[PDB]
Amino acid sequence: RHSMDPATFTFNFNNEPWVRGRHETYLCYEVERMHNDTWVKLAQRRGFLANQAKHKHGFLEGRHAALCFLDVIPFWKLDLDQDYRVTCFTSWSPCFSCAQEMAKFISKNKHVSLCIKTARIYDDKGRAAEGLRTLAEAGAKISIMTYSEFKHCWDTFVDHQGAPFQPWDGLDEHSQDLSGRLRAILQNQE
DNA sequence: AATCCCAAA
Ligand SMILES: [Zn+2]
Numbered sequence A: 001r002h003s004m005d006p007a008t009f010t011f012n013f014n015n016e017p018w019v020r021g022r023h024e025t026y027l028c029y030e031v032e033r034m035h036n037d038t039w040v041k042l043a044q045r046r047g048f049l050a051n052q053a054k055h056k057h058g059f060l061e062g063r064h065a066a067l068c069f070l071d072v073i074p075f076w077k078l079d080l081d082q083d084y085r086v087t088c089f090t091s092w093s094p095c096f097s098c099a100q101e102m103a104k105f106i107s108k109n110k111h112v113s114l115c116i117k118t119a120r121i122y123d124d125k126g127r128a129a130e131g132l133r134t135l136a137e138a139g140a141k142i143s144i145m146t147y148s149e150f151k152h153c154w155d156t157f158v159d160h161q162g163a164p165f166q167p168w169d170g171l172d173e174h175s176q177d178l179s180g181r182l183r184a185i186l187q188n189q190e
Numbered sequence B: 001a002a003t004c005c006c007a008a009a
Helices: A006-013 A065-076 A097-109 A128-137 A147-157 A169-184
Strands: A026-035 A038-050 A086-092 A112-120 A141-144
Touching: A006 A026, A006 A086, A006 A147, A026 A065, A026 A097, A026 A147, A038 A065, A065 A086, A065 A097, A086 A147, A097 A112, A097 A128, A128 A141, A128 A169, A147 A169
Parallel strands: A086 A112, A112 A141
Antiparallel strands: A026 A038, A026 A086
16 A cells, blocks of 8 residues: 555554564665755655565565565666665664675665664564674664654655644653663663 | 563464
8 A cells, every 4th residue: 555554553663662562563765865965855765564474375484574675675776876875764673684684785785875763672582782783883874763753754654644643652751762772782782 | 680572372
């Protein structure tokens, strides 16, 4: 569908750090090109997707959202001569294995600056922290989604039918708590 | 300390 279901958005992008029940991953993405020394939004290079769930017919092994995203980039046929900025708004941050695959991609495509903005930090059974450091080392800009970024995704990716963004309880405090943990992860303190 | 986990009951 063209726009995300609002209940799906609200459920999946809730940023209570230790909340239960989020066993899917959603990813919104947008692309900019550097032109006349400023980033310009590519209107048709944006969208959203979810993970291919384990046991889904036609993909019984599943496919994480980040991988599904890297899968669409070649079809953009990005000019190998231009600089691009690709921003992903992820409900869960990348697992170790998908962090490594994203790090390989930006190592191989130096004309792409990747920004990952995540609602929640995915622990990956203690393995994600080193994955995120490795992704940052490769040049990705990783941050915790804030109020204005949730609102941006509501306004521009969600099928809101005119309804304004309604922040959930604790959004800012959750964002700030996650930002401290992300900094600790990226500084190798966690 | 552990919480939490692109599910599994
Ligand atoms: Zn993954």
